[PDB]
Each structure stands twice: as C-alpha cells, then as structure tokens.
C-alpha cells in the first residue's frame, strides 16, 4: 500500500494498526491488506512487535474467508512460542471457523484441564454454543460463567445483548445498570439503558427513559440520539391521558426546548455543508408531531 | 410478482455487503407488474429490536416520501446466521404496521446462502400478507425489471468496492452531514448500464 494510493512509512502503518487494535474495529479487509504487507516487506524492521500483528492478521483473515494467511501466521506463532495457550486458542478458533466443533471442544477441555483458572476457553465454548443457534444453553452457560467470574464487563454486555435479542428487557436493563454502575462517565451505556426502558413498558418506564436521556445528553452535548429520544419521550408522556396537569405542562416545556435545540442543530449542520434537504424536512416532523 | 427495479436491488446488496457480520434492515418505497418499486433506504444495522430510533426514522422517511409523492410499501431484512432466512417478530410487526397504510405490502428476506459475489440467483424471498399471517409467494418467479442488467450492475458495483461510500440512517445519526438518499450510488448506476 506504500506508494500504492498512499504515501506512508512503516511507522505510520504500525501506528494505524495499533489504533485499530485499541478500539475494537472489525473492518477485516483493510486490516488484512495492511497486515500482509507489513508482515512480508517489513518483517525485520519490527524488532518485537510482529507477534501481536500476527494474531490480529490471523483473526482478520479468518473473518475474511482467506485461510492460507491464517495458516501461515498460525505456523509462525506456533514455531516462535512452543506450548503456549494463546496459540491453542487460535488453533481452536481456526478449527471452529471450518465447522469442526468437536475438535475445538476437546481442545478447550484439554486447555481447561491443564489450567483450571483460564477464562478464554470458557468464552470460546460459549461462542461455539452460540454459533449453532442454541440460545438458551448459551445464556445459561454465560450466567454460570458470570456467577464464577464477576466483574467482567464484556460478558455483562454480551449477556445484555443476548437478552435484548430474546425480547426480555427487564434482565437486559438490570445488566445495563450493572455496566453503568462501573462506568458512570460513559454516555453510551446511559443512552442504551434509556432506549431499553423506553421499549420496555409504560408511564414510569418512559419517565426513567426521559431522565436517562437527559443524563446522557448532559454527559455529552453531541449525542443526537439522546436528543431525539428525549424529545420523543417528552412528547409521548405529555399526550398520555393518565397524567396530572403539572407533569403534562413540564413535559410540554421539555418537548418545546428539545424541538428548539433540534432545529438549531440542524441549522448549524446546514450552514457548513449545503444540502438543505433535512432542514426543510425536520421542521415538518416537528410541526406535525406538535402537542 | 413485485418486479423490483435495479437501484433498489443494488442498494440492498451493497448495504448487506457493507456489514457482513451484522444484521441489516431498511425500507422500500413505491410511486403513488403489480407494484413497481423505485428505490430503497437502508435504515439500521446491528441490534434491531429497539423502538425509538426505528420510530423516528419511520416518521422522517414517511414525511420525506410524502413530500415527493411516494409511499412506503416494502420492508427488507437480512439475518446474521448463514442458515437463517425466516422472519422474526420485529419484521412482522413493522410489515403489519406498514400494511395498514398501503395494500399488498412486501416482506423481503435476504438469503445468505445465495449471496454469491457476481450472481447465481436473485437471492430474495418475497412474503405477502394473507389474512393475519405472511406466506412465501415464491413460484420461482423473477422479481426484477430485467435480471441480466441488474445482476451485471450489481456484480460490477461489488467488484469495484463501491460499498465503502454507501451511508445508511445510522451513519446519518452518528453525523448529520451524511445523506441517506445516496446520490453517488444513483449516479454510478445511471452511468453504469
């Protein structure tokens, strides 16, 4: 890719790969494109930085349906580190990527027998369970794993997503509360919890959804989803025929402020880039949904 | 038959191919064979069982279509598993909601098995609303205006790696300056015929 539609040094490629590693991006094609070149034409330049790149490129190639590079990287990693446990996990993932689940299960059982306090093998077994569509067994195994190993946020988020996919929202809301308690400075969790509470039930659930949408918008002022949700929840609560006058007028005031902010934001957006297609349209949405 | 046009098919294929590991869905519009569609608007990818953003998107798209004299008539979805092509509760709910404002609405399911690179088949399942349920009206029909041109254009667009410029409603919510009408895809399909 160097001198090929781009002009970057090997340091720039390494930094881009590291940044793609920090945030869990899953653009397999670009990762493979950069990684194969980095492995081939700059192997000696990287003193000790090639093993994590090997792992990342192998995973991306497995995701990209290109197994020759995966096998090459796996062979290199196995040759460098004999008897390691991460390499066994990679081998199991390669096995299960070809719809060979019994071998992966026996490999993970062997890993757990060698070391009983290992975490990745249990997660891979749960992934194997999920790959076959067996949702209830996966949920049960994930619940057992969380019972054994609490404080793992990835498992909590995965369980919340699985519960969302099954149209069971109370337990998903509980899991999102558990996630939000550890990370009170993250607006995305508040936004998702507000969405779940909006989708769950009726009046008090809508009140909590509005509260957490407001909290998410307070944490970050660039969150347009939070603003839209706040406006929609305020409008929904205002028109409910089982609310007192005080709550009705408070929600009307909230909706008016939200609509004004939305209109100002869309005017700001239209000022820079000239399209003028939604500023003429969002106003109609605001007008037709008034009161 | 419903006789999908070329732009809708190409945009659907591009949206399905942009996020292979996720589940994607969008909307189908028609002008105010049986009912000729004009184009499609991709709505969401990832987790789809959430109400508020779907409602906001539906309202905005309905208002925009009403401005330009269109009508929402179809709903297309693609699952995540490669061996799963049956409708779920969300698709049935959305299609039933749409059906109350327009007759003989379409429920389109993308088939992952026939999702080959260039073309092997239209890789589309069409469901029609009969009484209170949906039935697969698939008499091995041809739900396209002209299959050879459509498949050739879709194959060329896929080979050209042109799905990196497609933008759906989620990308519009992430940054307002994006456009969900996709003028670039329209220009590309107009030039490439």
């Amino acid at each position: 890719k160097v001198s090929e539609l781009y002009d970057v040094t090997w340091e720039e490629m390494r930094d881009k790969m590291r940044k793609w590693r920090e945030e869990n991006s899953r653009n397999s094609e670009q990762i493979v494109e950069v990684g194969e070149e980095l492995i081939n034409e700059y192997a000696s330049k990287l003193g000790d930085d090639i093993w994590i790149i090997y792992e990342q490129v192998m995973i991306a190639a497995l995701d990209y349906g290109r197994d020759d590079l995966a096998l090459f990287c796996l062979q290199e990693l196995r040759r460098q580190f004999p008897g390691s446990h991460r390499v066994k996990r990679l081998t199991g993932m390669r096995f299960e990527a070809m719809e060979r689940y019994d071998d992966a299960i026996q490999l993970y059982d062997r890993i757990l027998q060698e070391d009983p306090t290992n975490t990745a093998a249990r997660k891979r077994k749960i992934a194997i369970r999920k790959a076959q569509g067996k949702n209830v067994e996966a949920i049960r195994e994930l619940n057992e794993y969380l019972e054994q190993f609490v404080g793992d946020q990835e498992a909590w988020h995965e369980l919340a997503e699985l519960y969302i996919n099954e149209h069971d929202y109370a337990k998903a809301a509980f899991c999102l509360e558990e996630l939000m308690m550890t990370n009170p400075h993250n607006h995305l969790y508040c936004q998702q919890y507000a969405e779940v509470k909006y989708t769950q039930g009726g009046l008090e659930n809508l009140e909590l959804s509005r509260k957490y949408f407001a909290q998410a918008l307070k944490l970050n002022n660039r969150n347009m989803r939070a603003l839209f949700g706040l406006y929609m929840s305020a409008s929904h609560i205002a028109s409910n025929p089982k609310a007192s006058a005080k709550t009705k007028k408070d929600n009307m005031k909230y909706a008016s402020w939200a609509a004004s902010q939305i209109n100002r934001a869309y005017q700001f957006a239209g000022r820079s880039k000239k399209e003028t297609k939604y500023s003429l349209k969002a106003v109609e949405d605001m007008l037709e949904t008034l009161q | 038959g419903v006789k999908l046009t070329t732009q809708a098919y190409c945009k659907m294929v591009l949206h399905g191919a942009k996020y292979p590991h996720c589940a994607v869905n969008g909307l189908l519009v028609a002008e105010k064979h049986h009912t000729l569609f004009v184009d499609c608007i991709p709505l969401f990818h990832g987790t789809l069982a959430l109400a508020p953003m779907l409602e906001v998107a539906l309202t905005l798209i309905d208002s925009w279509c009403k401005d330009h004299s269109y009508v929402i008539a179809g709903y297309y979805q693609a699952n995540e598993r490669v061996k799963d092509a049956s409708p779920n509760q969300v698709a049935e709910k959305v299609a039933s909601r749409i059906a109350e404002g327009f007759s003989d609405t379409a429920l389109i399911m993308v088939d992952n098995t026939k999702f080959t690179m260039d073309c092997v088949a239209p890789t589309i399942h069409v469901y029609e609303h009969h009484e209170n349920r949906w039935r697969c009206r698939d008499p091995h029909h041809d739900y396209c205006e002209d299959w050879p041109e459509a498949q050739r254009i879709s194959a060329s667009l896929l080979d050209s790696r042109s799905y990196e410029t497609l933008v759906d409603f989620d990308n519009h919510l992430d940054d307002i300056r994006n456009d969900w009408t996709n003028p670039e895809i329209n220009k590309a399909v107009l030039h490439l015929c």
Partner: peptide, 21 residues
C-alpha cells in the same frame, strides 16, 4: 406519537421486585 409506533412484548445474581421503602 402517531401512526408509526411499534410495541415489542414478550436469574442474574441479585433480582428482587417489591417494596423496600
């Protein structure tokens, strides 16, 4: 608010339901 509106309807460690004022 109107027209387009969809209703989806259908033991992690601690889970209780009632009172505790």
């Amino acid at each position: 608010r109107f027209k387009w509106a969809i209703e989806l309807s259908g033991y992690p460690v601690g889970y209780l339901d009632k009172q505790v004022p």
